[PDB]
Amino acid sequence: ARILVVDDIEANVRLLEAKLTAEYYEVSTAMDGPTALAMAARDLPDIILLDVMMPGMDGFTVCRKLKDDPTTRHIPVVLITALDGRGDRIQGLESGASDFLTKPIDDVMLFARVRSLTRFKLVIDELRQREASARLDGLGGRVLIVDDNERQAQRVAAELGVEHRPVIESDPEKAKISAGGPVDLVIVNAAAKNFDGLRFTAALRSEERTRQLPVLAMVDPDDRGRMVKALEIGVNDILSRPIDPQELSARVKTQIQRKRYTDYLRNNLDHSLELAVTDQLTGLHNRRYMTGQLDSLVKRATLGGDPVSALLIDIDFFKKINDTFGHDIGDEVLREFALRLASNVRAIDLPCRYGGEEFVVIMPDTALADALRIAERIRMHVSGSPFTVAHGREMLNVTISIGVSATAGEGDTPEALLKRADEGVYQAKASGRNAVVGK
Amino acid sequence: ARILVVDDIEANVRLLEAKLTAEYYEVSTAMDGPTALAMAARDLPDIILLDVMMPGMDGFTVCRKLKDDPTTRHIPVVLITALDGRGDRIQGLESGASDFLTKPIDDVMLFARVRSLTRFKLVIDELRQREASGRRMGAARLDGLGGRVLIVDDNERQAQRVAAELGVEHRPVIESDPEKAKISAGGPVDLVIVNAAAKNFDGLRFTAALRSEERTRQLPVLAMVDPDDRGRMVKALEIGVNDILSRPIDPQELSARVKTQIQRKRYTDYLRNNLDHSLELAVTDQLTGLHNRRYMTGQLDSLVKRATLGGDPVSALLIDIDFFKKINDTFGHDIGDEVLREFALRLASNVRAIDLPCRYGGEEFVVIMPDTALADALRIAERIRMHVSGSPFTVAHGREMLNVTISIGVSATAGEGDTPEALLKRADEGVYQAKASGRNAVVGKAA
Ligand SMILES: Nc1nc2c(ncn2[C@@H]2O[C@@H]3COP(=O)(O)O[C@H]4[C@@H](O)[C@H](n5cnc6c(=O)[nH]c(N)nc65)O[C@@H]4COP(=O)(O)O[C@H]3[C@H]2O)c(=O)[nH]1
Ligand SMILES: Nc1nc2c(ncn2[C@@H]2O[C@@H]3COP(=O)(O)O[C@H]4[C@@H](O)[C@H](n5cnc6c(=O)[nH]c(N)nc65)O[C@@H]4COP(=O)(O)O[C@H]3[C@H]2O)c(=O)[nH]1
Ligand SMILES: Nc1nc2c(ncn2[C@@H]2O[C@@H]3COP(=O)(O)O[C@H]4[C@@H](O)[C@H](n5cnc6c(=O)[nH]c(N)nc65)O[C@@H]4COP(=O)(O)O[C@H]3[C@H]2O)c(=O)[nH]1
Ligand SMILES: Nc1nc2c(ncn2[C@@H]2O[C@@H]3COP(=O)(O)O[C@H]4[C@@H](O)[C@H](n5cnc6c(=O)[nH]c(N)nc65)O[C@@H]4COP(=O)(O)O[C@H]3[C@H]2O)c(=O)[nH]1
Ligand SMILES: Nc1nc2c(ncn2[C@@H]2O[C@H](COP(=O)(O)OP(=O)(O)O)[C@@H](OP(=O)(O)OP(=O)(O)O)[C@H]2O)c(=O)[nH]1
Ligand SMILES: Nc1nc2c(ncn2[C@@H]2O[C@H](COP(=O)(O)OP(=O)(O)O)[C@@H](OP(=O)(O)OP(=O)(O)O)[C@H]2O)c(=O)[nH]1
Ligand SMILES: [Mg+2]
Ligand SMILES: [Mg+2]
Ligand SMILES: [Mg+2]
Ligand SMILES: [Mg+2]
Numbered sequence: 025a026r027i028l029v030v031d032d033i034e035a036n037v038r039l040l041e042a043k044l045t046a047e048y049y050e051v052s053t054a055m056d057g058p059t060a061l062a063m064a065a066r067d068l069p070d071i072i073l074l075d076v077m078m079p080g081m082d083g084f085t086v087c088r089k090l091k092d093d094p095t096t097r098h099i100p101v102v103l104i105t106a107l108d109g110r111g112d113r114i115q116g117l118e119s120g121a122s123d124f125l126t127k128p129i130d131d132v133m134l135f136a137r138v139r140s141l142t143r144f145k146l147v148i149d150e151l152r153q154r155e156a157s158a159r160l161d162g163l164g165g166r167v168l169i170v171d172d173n174e175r176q177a178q179r180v181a182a183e184l185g186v187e188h189r190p191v192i193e194s195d196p197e198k199a200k201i202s203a204g205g206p207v208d209l210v211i212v213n214a215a216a217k218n219f220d221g222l223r224f225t226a227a228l229r230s231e232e233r234t235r236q237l238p239v240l241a242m243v244d245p246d247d248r249g250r251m252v253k254a255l256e257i258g259v260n261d262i263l264s265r266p267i268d269p270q271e272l273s274a275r276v277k278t279q280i281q282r283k284r285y286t287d288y289l290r291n292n293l294d295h296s297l298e299l300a301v302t303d304q305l306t307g308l309h310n311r312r313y314m315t316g317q318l319d320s321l322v323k324r325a326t327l328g329g330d331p332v333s334a335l336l337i338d339i340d341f342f343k344k345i346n347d348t349f350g351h352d353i354g355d356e357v358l359r360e361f362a363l364r365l366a367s368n369v370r371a372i373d374l375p376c377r378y379g380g381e382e383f384v385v386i387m388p389d390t391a392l393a394d395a396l397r398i399a400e401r402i403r404m405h406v407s408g409s410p411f412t413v414a415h416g417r418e419m420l421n422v423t424i425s426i427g428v429s430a431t432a433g434e435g436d437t438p439e440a441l442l443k444r445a446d447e448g449v450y451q452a453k454a455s456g457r458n459a460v461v462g463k
Numbered sequence: 464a465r466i467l468v469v470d471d472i473e474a475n476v477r478l479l480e481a482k483l484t485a486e487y488y489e490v491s492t493a494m495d496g497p498t499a500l501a502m503a504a505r506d507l508p509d510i511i512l513l514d515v516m517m518p519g520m521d522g523f524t525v526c527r528k529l530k531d532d533p534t535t536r537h538i539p540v541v542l543i544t545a546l547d548g549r550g551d552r553i554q555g556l557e558s559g560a561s562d563f564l565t566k567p568i569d570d571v572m573l574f575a576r577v578r579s580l581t582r583f584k585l586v587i588d589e590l591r592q593r594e595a596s597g598r599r600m601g602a603a604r605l606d607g608l609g610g611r612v613l614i615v616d617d618n619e620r621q622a623q624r625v626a627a628e629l630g631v632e633h634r635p636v637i638e639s640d641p642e643k644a645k646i647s648a649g650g651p652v653d654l655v656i657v658n659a660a661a662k663n664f665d666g667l668r669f670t671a672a673l674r675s676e677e678r679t680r681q682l683p684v685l686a687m688v689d690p691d692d693r694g695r696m697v698k699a700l701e702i703g704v705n706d707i708l709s710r711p712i713d714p715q716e717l718s719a720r721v722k723t724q725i726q727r728k729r730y731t732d733y734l735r736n737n738l739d740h741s742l743e744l745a746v747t748d749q750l751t752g753l754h755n756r757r758y759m760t761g762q763l764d765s766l767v768k769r770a771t772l773g774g775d776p777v778s779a780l781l782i783d784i785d786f787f788k789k790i791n792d793t794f795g796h797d798i799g800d801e802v803l804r805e806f807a808l809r810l811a812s813n814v815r816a817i818d819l820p821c822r823y824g825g826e827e828f829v830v831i832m833p834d835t836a837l838a839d840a841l842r843i844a845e846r847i848r849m850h851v852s853g854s855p856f857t858v859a860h861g862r863e864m865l866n867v868t869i870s871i872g873v874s875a876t877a878g879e880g881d882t883p884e885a886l887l888k889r890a891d892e893g894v895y896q897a898k899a900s901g902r903n904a905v906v907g908k909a910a
Pocket of ligand 3: 490591813814818832833835836843
């Protein structure tokens, strides 16, 4: 993940760059507003860490200008404030900040925030891609406060009561049940007295029903060990006590919006028919699945290595099957054909349904010479045995034409590889039927 | 998660029980074979940790008998072996063990194995539920063999040995360059075996790069680690490797861990690509965009259980559109579908996002309102009726206008022994009485 760090003092920038690079992050740096705005639009980073106090262009202005640009509006921005930054955080939210860090930088809080917002960036990126080809803000959620400190829980619920729908639970047993219902966020007190909030959190993560339910832990800043333990158990992010209203607002909004993005992408859009990856008739994968996998396969082959082979199989005279036996028997033949095809090719290969009665087999780490002999093996297994249909009442023979291609070259592309296999099929169809042709 | 620990010596059992309970596990104990087999069938634990050497019935026999019983065959079994336990691991795999631990027990290795196998147990449980449902209602590769395994290592002698060990049951591929490996890992790869102690690249940096990209974020990864360097082991597990392999690589350990990761992946992919996209397991109505009855039932179960324990009740609204056939008759089925889409938008806009406006039937909708009393639920239904009936529905790309009315039945969960079925049955009565006494009305039924 790529992080942009912005601070007027070079020593602050180098210190953060060293810490983040040690944790396997790709870090760029800027030391004033104009350069940071130019870098963000040019490089399009994943997260921006931004100091609020800089000469000339303050961080608030940089944040506002990042949200004005439509190409950088989606990039999470973290504002680094000072100890007493209540006013800064208030103006930070108005400027459009995602969350906050306070200096001097606490390493646990630093990486906790980065890890949370990088995961959010992943769903942000995915949602934008699908939108290019439903409540999606972070407000109005049911937030479950699990805490035995009444004064604290009531204060948290009051702060959350204007933007969300808060609910308090002192008993952990009742909280487990409520947490299994329509709950958007759980705020648990790590420093609880009558129950182990960390044990409670671990119970949530063990059950599949609640394994991905967002959890925020209220932690004591003196006890660093409990902070690390909570993050290890699987808490999404932590809130230092006493609870800051602006930090509470930001962190809750991030978790609820991340949840809604994920559920919308997985429950609605993934189950839609335009984005499906498996053919319902044959049970094989479709072209959408194949294209994604073939992209990486061809890219690796172009760098020098074992090539990728492609088999395009087309059933000969499939109309006649539908005309003589009916469309339902035709569907029986396609299902039985798909079973035979997958059974006689490696599970590491990609036998997919390419067209209506056309199939594709992508064979990684395979050369053209072998692919031609493999196509011959496939043809003999599907054409050598008859297809029994109509609950055993009818027997039918089938023949197929195959076109074969392999990825040889530095600038080869998935489209060129398949276009070369198409020609194989068209030439195999022209010169009779039941043949293999390699181009 | 519930773990069963089996050892003949009590001190060994208490030591493991203490370590595991400290990590928030529910631990049961047995001190001989017969007792462990009886406990396993009765309690059905999630993981069994089993000593190989016990008087009378050894661990190997217990493992074999666990796999013979069809009710416990699915429970992963970990065998605790000795130092030179090559024979133990060979005989363990023959007995049907899932994986192994070596004594003296290493806490890092202990929790790595348990965490790995508990996640596998989750998918196992889900697959078995779906298979139970399919049996009541009346062909993919689900073993752990034959996978494409990507070995990312610059040590030639090690990589060649690993590839040879994997070359009999799987399809191994070696990659020295981490850049080329990053690309291959995004294709049809079932497992990545990376060398944490590499010389020309940081295998742990490589692993973190895999986890950062969405394409490869859940790709199973095994890390080959040095047992001397405890810090690197913990760091690899923190980065997100699925499990670790101690060097030099044990053939039986390599076989076990690879099978576990590959089978877990195939279970997950089958459950998410095939079965989740089927109509029996969907949770969102594709037409209206609301959730459906399957989703509602799951959520309502927890909601009612909490209400029965004493607290704010749960209310239920059943909305049925009046004279929907006439819409289909006059304007056609496609305009009818437009009305349903527009109705769902109005319904969701006029209830809280914490509420559950779902498509209950064909033209029947349900609104589950948690922490809500009957008196308020009745006034909310009145709000809904006025918003749907007060404004006409624009259909046919703006060319046609239509009026719609709805009948609503309202109920709330009052009582300790109330059930979701009774709650909805009381709302059904409301709807049926609202239909009988004219249309465009709301009727409430209290217990
Ligand atoms: N992606 C893909 N490539 C294929 C397939 N069939 C053959 N090839 C490629 O062609 C090479 C020669 O395979 P073979 O002549 O049939 O001679 C093979 C074959 O007789 C046998 N073999 C390997 N795997 C299998 C298998 O899964 N089933 C059977 N019956 N024999 C296998 O071992 C011989 C050597 O195999 P390899 O060294 O791996 O090298 C193989 C492989 O790279 C396939 O179905 N899918
Ligand atoms: N002539 C030839 N045919 C190939 C080859 N590779 C795959 N096939 C064909 O495709 C079938 C499925 O192989 P698989 O899916 O990888 O699933 C295979 C594979 O996982 C394993 N297997 C069999 N032989 C070998 C082998 O030589 N090396 C490895 N690594 N696995 C093998 O057993 C499974 C069942 O294999 P089969 O029953 O024989 O049935 C095989 C075989 O008919 C090949 O290289 N040459
Ligand atoms: N699950 C669910 N329950 C509902 C709904 N509408 C009303 N209630 C329940 O009935 C209580 C009274 O709501 P009200 O009479 O309109 O009197 C309300 C209302 O005037 C206002 N209010 C709260 N949230 C909203 C809102 O989202 N939009 C508007 N326009 N007013 C709201 O604050 C008053 C007190 O509300 P509450 O304290 O929360 O206590 C509410 C709430 O518990 C609903 O749509 N869904
Ligand atoms: N914590 C809190 N948030 C508030 C309040 N007032 C408005 N909001 C927030 O602002 C969103 C829009 O509410 P609305 O425009 O009045 O339009 C609302 C309103 O028309 C109706 N509604 C929801 N609750 C109530 C209620 O309690 N009383 C009445 N009369 N209507 C409600 O449903 C619409 C959607 O409400 P939501 O889905 O939850 O989405 C609401 C909610 O997130 C409040 O008093 N307390
Ligand atoms: N039973 C069945 N047949 C399929 C399916 N997909 C395509 N068909 C059909 O395959 C037939 C084409 O077969 P070929 O005759 O070999 O086509 P080709 O010239 O390109 O090689 C078309 O006949 P058709 O009579 O026009 O079929 P249809 O239009 O009624 O679906 C086409 O509609 C399918 O999923 N199930
Ligand atoms: N456009 C559309 N209409 C739906 C859908 N689901 C149900 N309908 C309607 O639900 C109706 C069932 O009758 P009710 O709606 O309960 O009786 P009512 O009109 O008095 O309230 C179906 O009657 P039907 O006319 O006999 O069935 P149909 O021929 O319209 O499909 C059907 O019109 C849907 O998904 N899309
Ligand atoms: Mg400054
Ligand atoms: Mg054809
Ligand atoms: Mg012993
Ligand atoms: Mg109706």
